Structure formats: C-alpha cells, structure tokens
Design a binder for this molecule. Sequence first.
Ligand code: JYW
Ligand code: JYW
Ligand code: JYW
Ligand code: JYW
Lengths: 260, 260, 260, 260
Amino acid sequence: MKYMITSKGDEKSDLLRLNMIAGFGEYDMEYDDVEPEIVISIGGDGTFLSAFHQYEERLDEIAFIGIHTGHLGFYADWRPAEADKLVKLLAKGEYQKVSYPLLKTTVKYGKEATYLALNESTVKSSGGPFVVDVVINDIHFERFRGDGLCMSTPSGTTAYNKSLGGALMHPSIEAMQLTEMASINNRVYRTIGSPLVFPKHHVVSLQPVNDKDFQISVDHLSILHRDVQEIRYEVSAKKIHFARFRSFPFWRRVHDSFIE
Amino acid sequence: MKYMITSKGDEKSDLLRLNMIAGFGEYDMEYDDVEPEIVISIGGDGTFLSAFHQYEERLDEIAFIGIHTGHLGFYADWRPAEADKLVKLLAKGEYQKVSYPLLKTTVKYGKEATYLALNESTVKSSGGPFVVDVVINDIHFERFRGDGLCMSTPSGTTAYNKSLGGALMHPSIEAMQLTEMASINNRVYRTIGSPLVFPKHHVVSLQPVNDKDFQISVDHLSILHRDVQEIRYEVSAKKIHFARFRSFPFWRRVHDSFIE
Amino acid sequence: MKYMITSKGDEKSDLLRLNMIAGFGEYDMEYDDVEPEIVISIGGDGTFLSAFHQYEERLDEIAFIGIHTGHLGFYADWRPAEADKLVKLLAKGEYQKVSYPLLKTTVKYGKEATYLALNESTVKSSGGPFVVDVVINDIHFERFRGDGLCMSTPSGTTAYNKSLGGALMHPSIEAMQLTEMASINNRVYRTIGSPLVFPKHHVVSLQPVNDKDFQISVDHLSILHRDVQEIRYEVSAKKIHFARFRSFPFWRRVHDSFIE
Amino acid sequence: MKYMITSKGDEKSDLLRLNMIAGFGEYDMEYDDVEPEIVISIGGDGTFLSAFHQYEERLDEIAFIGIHTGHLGFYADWRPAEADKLVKLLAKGEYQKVSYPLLKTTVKYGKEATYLALNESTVKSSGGPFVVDVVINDIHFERFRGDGLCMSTPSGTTAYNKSLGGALMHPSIEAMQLTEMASINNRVYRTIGSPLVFPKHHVVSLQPVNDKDFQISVDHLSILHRDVQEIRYEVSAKKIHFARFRSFPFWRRVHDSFIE
Ligand SMILES: Nc1ncnc2c1nc(Br)n2CCCCO
Ligand SMILES: Nc1ncnc2c1nc(Br)n2CCCCO
Ligand SMILES: Nc1ncnc2c1nc(Br)n2CCCCO
Ligand SMILES: Nc1ncnc2c1nc(Br)n2CCCCO
C-alpha cells in the first residue's frame, strides 16, 4: 500500500528511515506522503504527535506506528532493532488495528475554530488573571480562578495531565479528564480541586468573566486567541488507529516509563 | 409491588417512614422486607449503604431510592418534602431505572471470600508496615510501600477516593479507580503516585511480601483477614439499580455537595 | 510625623483616604509622600504591595499599615470602621512595630539586577520547555523540568505558594520556601516534589541548561529577562516593619481567610 | 570517656560493633551503657531512633553518631568503611557538636503523660471516625475530619511528613510542621489542607469532639490512649546532640536519599 515515514531529523532517525524505505522497496509498497495508508514515526512521542497532526483529515484511512530512537515513548513504543521485522509484517498487511479516543476542542468568537488533540488542550490567561466559569452540560459548575485548566485524552493522561495530579486512564475508556493548574481556594473563590473525568457526549465549556483573550494549546500548538466567547470540550467522534504489531500493554508501557 | 423502608433511627427519619407507609397504604402496595421490589432509604448515604448491603443478593430485583433527612447525599439525593410525590409516582410504577457499576473484591487464603462494594474497598496493614506487590492483568506493576490502597467505584469517587487525591468519575463509566495512601518514594521504593483508572475486565491483584495479615474494608465493613494470599479487584458484572424520579445530574449533585 | 496614604482608586477607598487625612489634620502630622514615616494602604493586599514597592529604599524608616475596603487581606487586615481609631493612635505614636522577613532575588547576565519580594518570586520559561539546574549552597541538588518554580517569603506562603501545595509558615520564622510548578517525573527526570524550606544565609541558585531566557516575576512585576546566567535566592537582610495597632494573630488571619 | 554501641542485631552490624569496641580498647575509653557520653548506632535510622529513646533523659549529656550498614539514612549517615577513622577522632574528642530540635507531646486525661519525638507524632482514631478541634495558641482554628494528623520535627520532615505532602525543612530551623491525613472537605466540613509550620513557643492542641480514644504514635511507639481530654504539641526546649565528624549537609543528605 501507500506509506510514508517521518523522522526526528537527527542522524540515527534519518538513517533508520532510509533503511526501512530500502527494506520496503523489497515489497509491493510505494512511498506516498500525500495519501498514505501507513504512517511510521521515527524519533520520540513528539515526532509521533507531528505525524498525527500532519494527517488529521485522514485518520480513518491511516494506521500509525511509532519507533523511538531515544527513550521509550507511549506512542513511539517500538525499539529500532524491531525495524526489519516491522517492515516485514507491515508489508504483508493482515495486521490488527487498535483505536484511541480523541478530544475535540471548539473555540467560539464574536467565527468558530475546531481542533483535534491527541494528548490534551490547555487554557491559560494572556497575561493577567485567569478567570473562567465552568459549565458542564449547560449547568454552571464553578468559577475557576488560577493559572489555567487542562483537558486530557486517555492516552494523554501520562503527559501533562500526570504532572497536574491527574489520574492515569486506560485508553480503551472513551473519556476525557479535566485538571486544575494552581487554583485559588479561599472563602470567596471555590473550585472542586479534584480532577474530573467525563464520559462520551458530555460537553464542558469554558466561558470568560473579564478578559476574553486566552492562550490555548492543543498538543504542541499554542496560540493566543482573542475575543473568545466560549471554549467547549468533548470526546471526539473520530479516533486514531494504530497498527498492532504485538502485545505491549498500556500498563506495561506505564511501568516501563515511570517505575523501572 | 412489594416494598420496604429503612430508617436512620432518629426522630425525623422514623416519622417520615411511617408517613410514607401510610401513604403507600392508599395504593396497591404491600410491605415486604424479605422480597421487596422497591427499597427506600431515609437518613443519609450511610443509611443507603446499609440498605444496599442488606439486599446484596437481589440487586437485579430491586430499584433503590434515597431520601436525606440531613444534608444532601450522593445516594440519598431527595429532600423529605418530596416524600408524598415520591410515594405517588412509585406506586404507579412505569418509572425509569438507572444503573451504577459495582466493585468485586475477592480474597484468597491458604478458602475464598468475595464481597461487593458500592463505594470502595481499602487495604491497610494489621499494625506493622504495609507492603504489597501490585499485579495488573498478571504483570507485576509496582511494589507498594505505605499506609494502604483504595479501590473505588465510579459513584464512590466522591467519598474516600476524593480525600486521597483521586479523580471524580461519572458513574455511567464502567471503571474502577485505585489510589495510594501515604506512599513512600525514595531511590529504592518507587510507586506510580498517580491514581489509576481501570476499565471493565481488567484485574488488579495485591500480593503480600512479608506480613500476610491485612485490614480490609468494604464500604462500612472493616475486617482483619489473616493468612491472605491474594486480594484481587475488578469491576463487577452486577449493578445497582435506582428508580429515576426526575433529573438530578451527577455533576449537579457534585456541585451542590462541594461548591455551593 | 511625615505620613502618606495610597488608595485603590475606587470610590470607597478615595473617600476613606480623604477622611483620614482630615482626621490627621487635627494632629501634629504633615502629609509627605517623598520621605514619609508612616505609609497607610487603603484597598486590598495588592494595594499594600504597591505601597511596599513604592518605598523599597526606605523600609527601615517606614512602618506600614493596611486597611481593606473589600474582603480581609493578610497585609490589609484592618476594617474601614477602625480608621478613626487608627488615626488617633497613629498620631500619638508610642506604638509597637513588628517585622516580617523579605526575599532577595539576584539575576546575573552576560550586569546584575537585584529585587526585593514581599510575597514571592517565580521563574517560568519564555515559551519553550523550562529546564534549570537547582544548586543549594554550591552543591547541585536537582535538574528541574516543568512549568516553573516559586520562592516564597513567610507571609507570602498564603498567596501563590499555597496554591502550589506549599506549607503555611508563621512570619516570625526567618526562612524562604521553594515550590514546584507542574514538574515532570519519570525514570529519567527526577525532582524532589516536596516543598523545600530554607533558613537564613542559605543560597538557592537556578542555572540554565538550554534556553537562557526566563519570565521572572517579583510580586506584581513580571519581566522577561534575556541572556540570564544565574538566578539566586536568599532571605534578605532587610525587613518590612508594620505598626502594631492591636492583637491580630497570623493564624487567626489564616482562619478568617480560608476557614470561616 | 564512657561510650556504648547499639546494633541492628544482624550479622554485619554485630561484627562492626565488635570491631569498633576492639578499636576503642586501644584508647582511654570505657564501655558504659548506663551513663555513656557517646552513643553509636549501627544499622539504620530505626536503630538510631531506638538509641535516641533509650537515653531520652540524658540528651544534654550524650553526642549521638549513626552508622548505616544498609542504605544511607538521615541519622545513620556514615558508611561502615569510616568506622576506623570514626573510632580515632571520637577517642581524642575535641570534635564539634550539632543540635536538632525536638517535639514535645503532652497528653491529658480525666493524669498527664509527656513524650519526646525525634521524627513525628501522629494521632488517629481508635476505629470509628476521627474528629478533633484544632486550637492554636488558645484560638480555635478548625474542626478536623479525616484519618488523622501528623506533627513533625524538622529532621522528621524527610520521613512520614514527606509522604503526606509536607515540606522538607532544614533542621537548623526551630519549628514543627503539622500535616493532614486524608481530610474530608465539603460544604460543611472545612480544613486548611495546607501543611502548617509553627515556630518555637507556639502551642497546638487537639481536643476531642465525640470519641475520646485515640491511637497516638511517637516515632516507633504507637499506643492506644483512652479518656483523652487534650493533646498539645510544641517545640521542645531539649535538643539532640550529634558529634560532627565532617561536612555532610542536610540538603546533600536529601539529594542522596531521594534524587540520586
Ligand atoms: N502521551 C504521553 N505520555 C507521556 N509522555 C508523553 C506523552 N506524549 C508526549 Br509528546 N510525551 C512526552 C513529552 C511530554 C511529557 O509530559
Ligand atoms: N459516595 C459518596 N460520595 C460522597 N460522600 C459519601 C459517599 N458515600 C458516603 Br457513605 N458518603 C459520606 C460519608 C463518607 C464521606 O467520605
Ligand atoms: N500574602 C498573601 N496571602 C494571601 N493572599 C494574598 C497575599 N498577598 C496577596 Br496580593 N494576596 C491576594 C492575591 C494573591 C492570591 O494568591
Ligand atoms: N528522619 C527520617 N527521614 C527519612 N527517613 C527516615 C527518617 N527516619 C526514619 Br526511622 N526513616 C526511615 C523510615 C521511615 C520512612 O518514612
């Protein structure tokens, strides 16, 4: 089928890419980076994220694969020594696919911009104090005061979510998790404190109180949005598809990255 | 149908019980506390828990209802002023039912004892140091050192789970959440720290390292178990059923209890 | 003596200022905002902070006083109804003074800039990843990876420090407290996690690893510093002096602000 | 002078004790475990704690020394390979001494019992719910609801205090730190959450609300006290004295134990 390979750009990653291409040349495979069916990332999780966002509009047409040249990653979870055996089983096809949920972020202005996040989306102030009203399924839940908020995907919970006290969530759970960043709690400002986990079809919207300018991040991309009326979060109907090469459980991946 | 009513035992709760019984006497309803179809709890969440455990073996035959005479509860979420309108719509039937997931706890000895928890199950030491190996789906995840662990249901996340930094989880999510209690982390002992959320059919087992005696709690019940070989957790195949009286969302329930 | 009064600028604060000035006119007191001996702040804690920084170079010549027109503050801790009795005992003099410790921040470039903080000083990245080596009394303590760090004064622990999990410290303790902001901890990056409390004459220096540009805050002032070689923290030899009007304990102040 | 040596009791520790005694026999030193001037602990921090509590009544007459046969400890901070050079400089004397603060715990009944803690003192319930009123310098600060409380010494902050989110405090600071254990916080029960650090001469007293039986720990010793009227904490006027063998800073000790 059609395939393509992105590289971190350093020496080891570029050479592993060329060796896999040459190996692919021994099969009924053609290199197409416009309409690929297989997208291979070589580098780290960040390299995988860029590969994800390069092909956001063809997610249901692509099975992704990640190779880590550095330390183990949660998306780049195959060692370089498995590249040759990766090429062989990829070329035959007949492999299984696994799907992770994604987070949809909609921003409303005085038009409307929608983004897809594989890890998380964060909202911070543009300089002054960050204050938003949190509305869950149209009911006002809290007035949040602090540094900002973070809405994470399941597989994103091992990233920024984890640093903010969030729980680690198995990616087979179609959910999204919201965590707080340095919240103020006194007798006048009150926040839940606890991380919140939302199921599918629940809608979490952030609404400004004073300043309508916010710094909004979506994975690597961080952009200052102005005259924002609403930021609403929900589990996306779209999913990312991975090619299943062998058994590498999420919890084993979690153990290897944080325990030993 | 057959119904019964439990009471906290104080003055207000006993009188509300007798008024509802008299009101029920105006309908095709008979009081049976052996094989009831409707179980009404009057008091607090603790009163509801006891009502739950009184009828553990007939969960799929019973729709529970909670009335709080004191402050609002997460299971006893109807005010006493709604008792008369509760009696009327209960007697007709034709009401909707909602179901929450439950946690199954299995304890193995050198026989085997199984329990059902509506909120959570905790494991602590019997006096000395608490040390267990945590095994997830047969792979060794961590050696936990500290005060103990807590495995919570979705609806249980607003109880003890919340106090231990756990996330709040919508009860429509079939999952269980594991949190740590005062864990030791140095260069030799390592724990994940983060709360873990497990989907259905994932099995979390605790295995002793030195002492085989543990203080095991299941909701209100706390029992010292001796010569324990294994404690394994998993989302139960059984569910608790609530009679749906009107719209009282979980997140609104969360807001009322903790925010305002 | 010479005195001056700053105001939040809103209606209630300007009117309370004019009433206190008129009351002061009934005594041997002259209004001098160049070399005042008494500085009265009317508004909130932020109004007090600006009053503090307006007169940084004459701290040992000035006894500060804070009046809150809004909610209670930790520096503006006198109600407006006490203004007339404040004017009277201030004009006589013979009052007691209390002193709080201050934090000295030194920034080194490829000259050198020194600041005094009443609450805290924070260091964040300029956009990319924030990475610094933490050096305590010339020994390398940790390589910090995350959002940033916060070094707080004792009286500053009830502000930003508190939101980051820091401890609340009685201001009679000559110390400074360092807290982490969303730190990364895996098998390769390690941080202490815990807040650190340093005594007098201990020096904490932050040293860049890659990017030498940092966003440095000192109370309200937040400035982007470029080509930074070192940021070193230590308890200042200077102290802020408050005029003691009656008994308002720090722990009572803490209770009123956060408990009830 | 008079000296004695305690041992963990395992093989390596008993043999190191006998070698140091034989080495001491080459000097003007006599073994007295009744009125020793030097107390050497061989094993771990727990071995040092028992050595501390064996000689509580002669603290100002004794300079303690800790040797770790296992991993590094905060009190047993000298390697076994330094035993021979330890014996030599100990026998001459003329060494420097360093002093750490201690925590005094007073328990009142319906007589009165006082204890000295080197690490911390914890209070938990005897089975049911733990509820106490917290009174600071005679003013009521909070009604605490949860698992329990922990009052730590400076050098004790690296133990249990650290696991409960407490700050790490340099032992030259004469202070005590109070942390919470799994506290309940809703709209009706309120706690400060943050750890509290108290200076010398501040008195923190715990007072029962319902149950007057509490499980009180002081370092290793944990005892069930009945009919308790009050538990009050304060920094002790007594201090533990260490013999200063060379430069081993607390922060270096902290780095070695938790970072690398
Ligand atoms: N999903 C993930 N889980 C754990 N680490 C991840 C991650 N995605 C990325 Br990119 N990283 C590493 C950089 C950010 C670290 O906070
Ligand atoms: N599910 C729940 N959510 C919040 N509170 C609950 C609860 N169940 C019970 Br009983 N309570 C109150 C007593 C325990 C408080 O920690
Ligand atoms: N020292 C302090 N303690 C508690 N609140 C303070 C404070 N100084 C200021 Br300004 N504030 C309020 C604004 C910042 C809130 O985080
Ligand atoms: N002061 C201390 N600092 C760090 N560890 C200590 C300690 N005292 C003891 Br005993 N230990 C180890 C056992 C308890 C671990 O929580």
